[PDB]
Amino acid sequence: ADLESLYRAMPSIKKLVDEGKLTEKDAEKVYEIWRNMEAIYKQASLLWYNTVDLLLKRIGLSEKEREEIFYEMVRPYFRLFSREEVF
Amino acid sequence: ADLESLYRAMPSIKKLVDEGKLTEKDAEKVYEIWRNMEAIYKQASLLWYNTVDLLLKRIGLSEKEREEIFYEMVRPYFRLFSREEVF
């Protein structure tokens, strides 16, 4: 049910496999990374809830207002950083 | 030059300080979190470049085609995870 979940989430990978360009073994690797990515990005929310969220709650901001500030903080980060930026 | 950079990037935080709701020390904490948050999104890009990007390179995909696949993989993660998801 792994690859099934993957192909649904990522039609591009399903296509590559159907096209014979990626093997099923390859697709299993991609699945692992897909799941791994969730764990990394979840860090951002965990950090948020234990730092700035608490500060904003303390000064009375509503849920919606606090969420808006989060997106203001991280929206520019919603991208694939270039190799030069990370390497 | 810290707080000035933060204020340019986060008008909402500048406003809260100007309104007297957030102290300057408060803003100093926000700066650090703002900076730290970037590393999380970089870590995800690093995993990409070291795994799936290599696979797709081998099979001949272009830089644009590979980038499209990255966004297909991670777009659902570009959000604030709920407290129930993380805790």
Coordinates of N, CA and C in Angstrom, one line a residue:
Chain A
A1 N 0.8 -1.2 0.0 CA 0.0 0.0 0.0 C 0.9 1.3 0.0
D2 N 2.2 1.1 0.2 CA 3.1 2.2 0.1 C 3.1 2.9 -1.2
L3 N 3.6 2.1 -2.3 CA 3.6 2.7 -3.6 C 2.3 3.2 -4.1
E4 N 1.2 2.6 -3.6 CA -0.1 3.1 -3.9 C -0.4 4.5 -3.4
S5 N 0.0 4.7 -2.2 CA 0.0 6.0 -1.5 C 0.8 7.0 -2.3
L6 N 2.0 6.6 -2.7 CA 3.0 7.4 -3.4 C 2.5 7.9 -4.7
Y7 N 2.0 6.9 -5.5 CA 1.6 7.2 -6.9 C 0.4 8.2 -6.8
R8 N -0.5 8.1 -5.8 CA -1.6 9.0 -5.7 C -1.1 10.4 -5.4
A9 N -0.2 10.5 -4.4 CA 0.4 11.8 -4.1 C 1.2 12.4 -5.2
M10 N 1.9 11.6 -5.9 CA 2.9 12.0 -6.9 C 2.7 11.4 -8.3
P11 N 1.7 11.9 -9.0 CA 1.4 11.4 -10.4 C 2.6 11.4 -11.3
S12 N 3.6 12.3 -11.1 CA 4.8 12.4 -11.9 C 5.7 11.1 -11.7
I13 N 5.7 10.6 -10.5 CA 6.5 9.4 -10.3 C 5.8 8.2 -10.9
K14 N 4.5 8.1 -10.7 CA 3.7 7.0 -11.3 C 4.0 7.0 -12.8
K15 N 3.9 8.1 -13.5 CA 4.2 8.2 -14.9 C 5.6 7.7 -15.3
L16 N 6.6 8.1 -14.5 CA 8.0 7.7 -14.8 C 8.1 6.2 -14.7
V17 N 7.5 5.6 -13.7 CA 7.5 4.2 -13.5 C 6.7 3.5 -14.7
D18 N 5.5 4.0 -15.0 CA 4.8 3.4 -16.1 C 5.5 3.5 -17.4
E19 N 6.3 4.5 -17.6 CA 7.1 4.8 -18.8 C 8.4 3.9 -18.9
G20 N 8.7 3.2 -17.8 CA 9.8 2.4 -17.7 C 11.1 3.1 -17.4
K21 N 11.0 4.4 -16.9 CA 12.2 5.2 -16.6 C 12.6 5.0 -15.2
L22 N 11.7 4.8 -14.3 CA 12.0 4.4 -12.9 C 11.6 3.0 -12.6
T23 N 12.4 2.2 -11.9 CA 12.0 0.9 -11.5 C 11.2 1.0 -10.3
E24 N 10.5 -0.1 -9.9 CA 9.7 -0.2 -8.7 C 10.5 0.0 -7.5
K25 N 11.7 -0.6 -7.5 CA 12.7 -0.4 -6.4 C 13.0 1.1 -6.2
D26 N 13.2 1.8 -7.3 CA 13.5 3.3 -7.3 C 12.3 4.0 -6.6
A27 N 11.1 3.6 -7.0 CA 9.9 4.2 -6.5 C 9.7 4.0 -5.0
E28 N 10.3 2.9 -4.5 CA 10.2 2.6 -3.1 C 11.2 3.6 -2.3
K29 N 12.3 3.8 -2.9 CA 13.2 4.8 -2.4 C 12.6 6.2 -2.3
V30 N 11.9 6.6 -3.3 CA 11.2 7.9 -3.4 C 10.1 7.9 -2.3
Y31 N 9.5 6.8 -2.1 CA 8.5 6.8 -1.0 C 9.1 7.1 0.3
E32 N 10.3 6.5 0.6 CA 10.9 6.7 1.9 C 11.3 8.2 2.0
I33 N 11.8 8.8 1.0 CA 12.1 10.2 1.0 C 10.9 11.1 1.3
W34 N 9.8 10.8 0.5 CA 8.5 11.5 0.7 C 8.1 11.5 2.1
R35 N 8.1 10.4 2.8 CA 7.8 10.3 4.2 C 8.8 11.0 5.1
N36 N 10.1 11.0 4.7 CA 11.1 11.6 5.5 C 11.0 13.1 5.4
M37 N 10.6 13.7 4.3 CA 10.3 15.1 4.1 C 9.3 15.6 5.1
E38 N 8.3 14.8 5.3 CA 7.2 15.2 6.3 C 7.8 15.5 7.6
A39 N 8.7 14.6 8.1 CA 9.4 14.7 9.4 C 10.2 15.9 9.5
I40 N 10.9 16.3 8.5 CA 11.7 17.5 8.5 C 10.9 18.8 8.6
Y41 N 9.9 18.9 7.7 CA 9.0 20.1 7.7 C 8.2 20.2 9.0
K42 N 7.9 19.1 9.6 CA 7.2 19.1 10.9 C 8.0 19.9 12.0
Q43 N 9.3 19.8 11.9 CA 10.2 20.6 12.8 C 9.7 22.1 12.9
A44 N 9.4 22.7 11.8 CA 9.0 24.1 11.7 C 7.8 24.3 12.6
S45 N 6.8 23.5 12.6 CA 5.6 23.6 13.4 C 5.9 23.4 14.9
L46 N 6.7 22.3 15.2 CA 7.1 22.0 16.5 C 7.8 23.2 17.2
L47 N 8.8 23.8 16.5 CA 9.5 25.0 17.0 C 8.5 26.1 17.2
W48 N 7.7 26.4 16.2 CA 6.7 27.5 16.3 C 5.9 27.4 17.6
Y49 N 5.3 26.2 17.8 CA 4.4 26.1 19.0 C 5.0 26.2 20.3
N50 N 6.4 26.1 20.4 CA 7.1 26.2 21.6 C 7.9 27.5 21.8
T51 N 7.7 28.4 20.9 CA 8.5 29.7 20.9 C 7.6 30.9 20.6
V52 N 7.5 31.3 19.4 CA 6.8 32.5 19.0 C 5.3 32.4 19.2
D53 N 4.7 31.2 19.0 CA 3.3 31.0 19.3 C 3.0 31.3 20.7
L54 N 3.9 30.9 21.7 CA 3.6 31.2 23.1 C 3.7 32.7 23.4
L55 N 4.6 33.4 22.8 CA 4.8 34.8 23.0 C 3.5 35.5 22.5
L56 N 3.0 35.1 21.3 CA 1.9 35.8 20.7 C 0.6 35.5 21.5
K57 N 0.5 34.2 22.0 CA -0.7 33.8 22.8 C -0.7 34.7 24.1
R58 N 0.5 34.9 24.7 CA 0.6 35.7 25.9 C 0.1 37.1 25.7
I59 N 0.3 37.7 24.6 CA -0.2 39.1 24.4 C -1.6 39.1 23.7
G60 N -2.3 38.0 23.7 CA -3.7 38.0 23.4 C -4.1 37.7 22.0
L61 N -3.2 37.4 21.1 CA -3.5 37.1 19.7 C -4.4 35.9 19.5
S62 N -5.3 35.9 18.6 CA -6.2 34.8 18.3 C -5.4 33.8 17.5
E63 N -6.0 32.6 17.4 CA -5.4 31.5 16.6 C -5.1 31.9 15.2
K64 N -6.1 32.6 14.5 CA -6.0 33.0 13.1 C -4.9 34.0 13.0
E65 N -4.8 35.0 13.9 CA -3.7 36.0 13.9 C -2.3 35.4 14.1
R66 N -2.2 34.4 14.9 CA -0.9 33.8 15.2 C -0.5 33.0 13.9
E67 N -1.5 32.3 13.3 CA -1.2 31.5 12.1 C -0.7 32.4 11.0
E68 N -1.4 33.5 10.8 CA -1.0 34.5 9.8 C 0.5 34.9 10.0
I69 N 0.9 35.1 11.2 CA 2.3 35.5 11.5 C 3.3 34.4 11.2
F70 N 2.9 33.2 11.4 CA 3.7 32.0 11.0 C 3.9 32.0 9.5
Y71 N 2.9 32.1 8.8 CA 3.0 32.1 7.3 C 3.8 33.3 6.8
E72 N 3.7 34.5 7.5 CA 4.5 35.6 7.2 C 6.0 35.3 7.4
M73 N 6.3 34.6 8.4 CA 7.7 34.2 8.8 C 8.3 33.2 7.8
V74 N 7.5 32.2 7.4 CA 8.1 31.1 6.7 C 7.8 31.0 5.2
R75 N 6.8 31.8 4.7 CA 6.5 31.8 3.3 C 7.6 31.9 2.3
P76 N 8.6 32.8 2.6 CA 9.7 32.9 1.7 C 10.6 31.6 1.7
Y77 N 10.4 30.8 2.7 CA 11.2 29.5 2.8 C 10.5 28.4 2.1
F78 N 9.3 28.6 1.6 CA 8.5 27.6 0.9 C 9.0 27.3 -0.5
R79 N 10.2 26.8 -0.6 CA 10.8 26.6 -1.9 C 12.0 25.7 -1.9
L80 N 12.5 25.3 -3.0 CA 13.7 24.5 -3.1 C 14.9 25.5 -3.1
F81 N 15.6 25.5 -2.0 CA 16.8 26.4 -2.0 C 17.8 26.0 -3.0
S82 N 18.5 26.9 -3.6 CA 19.5 26.6 -4.6 C 20.7 25.8 -4.0
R83 N 21.4 25.1 -4.8 CA 22.6 24.4 -4.4 C 23.6 25.3 -3.7
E84 N 23.7 26.5 -4.2 CA 24.6 27.5 -3.7 C 24.2 27.9 -2.3
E85 N 22.9 28.0 -2.1 CA 22.3 28.4 -0.8 C 22.6 27.4 0.3
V86 N 22.7 26.1 0.0 CA 22.8 25.1 1.0 C 24.2 24.4 1.0
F87 N 24.7 24.2 -0.2 CA 26.0 23.5 -0.3 C 27.2 24.4 -0.1
Chain B
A1 N 22.1 45.2 13.1 CA 21.2 45.2 11.9 C 20.1 44.1 12.0
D2 N 20.1 43.4 13.1 CA 19.2 42.3 13.2 C 17.7 42.7 13.1
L3 N 17.3 43.5 14.1 CA 15.9 43.9 14.2 C 15.4 44.6 13.0
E4 N 16.2 45.3 12.3 CA 15.8 46.0 11.1 C 15.6 45.0 10.0
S5 N 16.4 44.0 9.9 CA 16.1 42.9 8.9 C 14.8 42.2 9.2
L6 N 14.6 41.9 10.5 CA 13.4 41.2 10.9 C 12.2 42.0 10.5
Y7 N 12.2 43.3 10.8 CA 11.1 44.2 10.6 C 10.7 44.3 9.1
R8 N 11.7 44.3 8.3 CA 11.5 44.3 6.8 C 10.8 43.1 6.4
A9 N 11.3 41.9 6.9 CA 10.7 40.6 6.5 C 9.4 40.4 7.2
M10 N 9.1 40.9 8.3 CA 7.9 40.7 9.1 C 7.2 41.9 9.6
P11 N 6.5 42.6 8.7 CA 5.7 43.8 9.0 C 4.8 43.6 10.2
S12 N 4.3 42.4 10.4 CA 3.3 42.2 11.4 C 4.0 42.3 12.8
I13 N 5.3 41.9 12.9 CA 6.0 42.0 14.1 C 6.5 43.4 14.4
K14 N 6.9 44.1 13.4 CA 7.2 45.5 13.5 C 6.0 46.3 14.1
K15 N 4.8 46.0 13.5 CA 3.6 46.7 14.0 C 3.3 46.4 15.5
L16 N 3.4 45.1 15.9 CA 3.2 44.7 17.3 C 4.1 45.5 18.2
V17 N 5.4 45.6 17.8 CA 6.4 46.4 18.7 C 6.0 47.8 18.7
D18 N 5.7 48.4 17.5 CA 5.3 49.8 17.5 C 4.0 50.1 18.3
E19 N 3.1 49.1 18.4 CA 1.9 49.3 19.1 C 2.1 49.1 20.6
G20 N 3.3 48.7 21.0 CA 3.7 48.5 22.4 C 3.3 47.2 22.9
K21 N 2.9 46.3 22.1 CA 2.4 44.9 22.6 C 3.6 43.9 22.7
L22 N 4.6 44.1 21.8 CA 5.8 43.3 21.9 C 7.0 44.1 22.3
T23 N 7.8 43.7 23.3 CA 8.9 44.4 23.7 C 10.1 44.1 22.7
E24 N 11.1 45.0 22.8 CA 12.3 44.8 21.9 C 13.0 43.5 22.1
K25 N 13.1 43.1 23.4 CA 13.7 41.8 23.7 C 12.8 40.7 23.2
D26 N 11.5 40.9 23.2 CA 10.6 40.0 22.6 C 11.0 39.8 21.1
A27 N 11.1 40.9 20.4 CA 11.5 41.0 19.0 C 12.8 40.3 18.7
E28 N 13.7 40.4 19.7 CA 15.0 39.7 19.6 C 14.9 38.2 19.6
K29 N 14.0 37.7 20.4 CA 13.7 36.3 20.4 C 13.1 35.8 19.0
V30 N 12.2 36.6 18.5 CA 11.6 36.4 17.2 C 12.6 36.3 16.1
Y31 N 13.5 37.2 16.1 CA 14.6 37.2 15.2 C 15.3 35.9 15.1
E32 N 15.7 35.4 16.3 CA 16.5 34.1 16.4 C 15.7 33.0 15.8
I33 N 14.4 32.9 16.1 CA 13.5 31.9 15.6 C 13.3 32.0 14.1
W34 N 13.2 33.2 13.6 CA 13.1 33.5 12.2 C 14.3 33.0 11.4
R35 N 15.5 33.2 12.0 CA 16.7 32.7 11.4 C 16.8 31.2 11.5
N36 N 16.5 30.7 12.6 CA 16.5 29.2 12.8 C 15.6 28.4 11.9
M37 N 14.4 29.0 11.7 CA 13.4 28.4 10.8 C 14.0 28.1 9.4
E38 N 14.8 29.0 8.9 CA 15.3 28.9 7.6 C 16.1 27.6 7.4
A39 N 16.9 27.2 8.5 CA 17.7 26.0 8.4 C 16.8 24.7 8.2
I40 N 15.6 24.8 8.7 CA 14.7 23.6 8.6 C 14.4 23.4 7.1
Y41 N 14.0 24.5 6.4 CA 13.7 24.4 5.0 C 14.9 24.1 4.1
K42 N 16.0 24.5 4.6 CA 17.3 24.2 3.9 C 17.6 22.7 4.0
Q43 N 17.3 22.1 5.2 CA 17.6 20.7 5.5 C 16.8 19.8 4.5
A44 N 15.6 20.2 4.2 CA 14.7 19.5 3.3 C 15.3 19.6 1.9
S45 N 15.8 20.8 1.5 CA 16.4 20.9 0.2 C 17.6 20.0 0.1
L46 N 18.4 20.0 1.1 CA 19.6 19.1 1.2 C 19.3 17.7 1.0
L47 N 18.3 17.2 1.7 CA 17.8 15.8 1.5 C 17.5 15.5 0.0
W48 N 16.7 16.4 -0.6 CA 16.3 16.3 -2.0 C 17.6 16.2 -2.9
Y49 N 18.5 17.1 -2.8 CA 19.7 17.1 -3.6 C 20.5 15.8 -3.4
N50 N 20.5 15.2 -2.3 CA 21.3 14.0 -2.0 C 20.6 12.7 -2.2
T51 N 19.3 12.7 -2.6 CA 18.6 11.5 -2.8 C 17.8 11.5 -4.2
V52 N 16.6 11.9 -4.1 CA 15.7 11.9 -5.3 C 16.3 12.7 -6.5
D53 N 16.9 13.8 -6.2 CA 17.5 14.6 -7.3 C 18.5 13.8 -8.1
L54 N 19.3 13.0 -7.4 CA 20.3 12.2 -8.0 C 19.7 11.2 -8.9
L55 N 18.7 10.5 -8.4 CA 18.0 9.5 -9.2 C 17.4 10.1 -10.5
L56 N 16.7 11.2 -10.4 CA 16.1 11.8 -11.5 C 17.1 12.4 -12.5
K57 N 18.3 12.8 -12.0 CA 19.4 13.2 -12.8 C 19.8 12.1 -13.7
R58 N 20.0 10.9 -13.1 CA 20.5 9.7 -13.8 C 19.6 9.3 -15.0
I59 N 18.3 9.6 -14.9 CA 17.4 9.2 -15.9 C 17.1 10.3 -16.9
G60 N 17.8 11.4 -16.8 CA 17.9 12.4 -17.8 C 16.9 13.6 -17.7
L61 N 16.2 13.7 -16.5 CA 15.3 14.8 -16.3 C 16.1 16.2 -16.3
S62 N 15.4 17.2 -16.8 CA 16.0 18.5 -16.7 C 15.9 19.2 -15.4
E63 N 16.6 20.2 -15.1 CA 16.5 20.9 -13.8 C 15.1 21.4 -13.6
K64 N 14.4 21.8 -14.6 CA 13.0 22.3 -14.4 C 12.1 21.2 -14.1
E65 N 12.3 20.0 -14.8 CA 11.5 18.9 -14.6 C 11.7 18.3 -13.2
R66 N 12.9 18.3 -12.7 CA 13.2 17.8 -11.4 C 12.6 18.7 -10.3
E67 N 12.7 20.0 -10.5 CA 12.1 20.9 -9.6 C 10.6 20.8 -9.5
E68 N 9.9 20.5 -10.6 CA 8.5 20.3 -10.6 C 8.1 19.1 -9.7
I69 N 8.9 18.1 -9.8 CA 8.7 16.9 -9.0 C 8.9 17.1 -7.5
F70 N 10.0 17.9 -7.2 CA 10.2 18.4 -5.8 C 8.9 19.0 -5.2
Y71 N 8.4 20.0 -6.0 CA 7.2 20.7 -5.5 C 6.0 19.8 -5.4
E72 N 5.9 18.9 -6.3 CA 4.8 17.9 -6.2 C 4.9 17.1 -4.9
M73 N 6.1 16.8 -4.5 CA 6.4 16.0 -3.3 C 6.1 16.8 -2.0
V74 N 6.5 18.1 -2.0 CA 6.5 18.8 -0.7 C 5.5 19.9 -0.5
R75 N 4.8 20.3 -1.6 CA 3.8 21.3 -1.4 C 2.8 21.1 -0.3
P76 N 2.3 19.9 -0.1 CA 1.4 19.6 1.0 C 2.0 19.9 2.4
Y77 N 3.3 20.0 2.4 CA 4.0 20.2 3.7 C 4.3 21.6 4.0
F78 N 4.0 22.5 3.0 CA 4.2 23.9 3.2 C 3.1 24.6 3.9
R79 N 3.0 24.2 5.2 CA 1.8 24.7 6.0 C 2.2 24.6 7.5
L80 N 1.3 25.2 8.3 CA 1.5 25.0 9.8 C 0.7 23.7 10.1
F81 N 1.5 22.7 10.6 CA 0.9 21.4 11.0 C 0.1 21.7 12.3
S82 N -1.1 21.1 12.4 CA -1.9 21.3 13.6 C -1.2 20.8 14.9
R83 N -1.6 21.3 16.0 CA -1.0 20.8 17.3 C -1.3 19.3 17.4
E84 N -2.4 18.8 16.9 CA -2.8 17.4 17.0 C -1.9 16.5 16.1
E85 N -1.4 17.1 15.0 CA -0.5 16.4 14.2 C 0.9 16.2 14.8
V86 N 1.4 17.3 15.5 CA 2.7 17.3 16.0 C 2.8 16.8 17.5
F87 N 1.7 16.9 18.2 CA 1.6 16.5 19.6 C 0.5 15.4 19.8

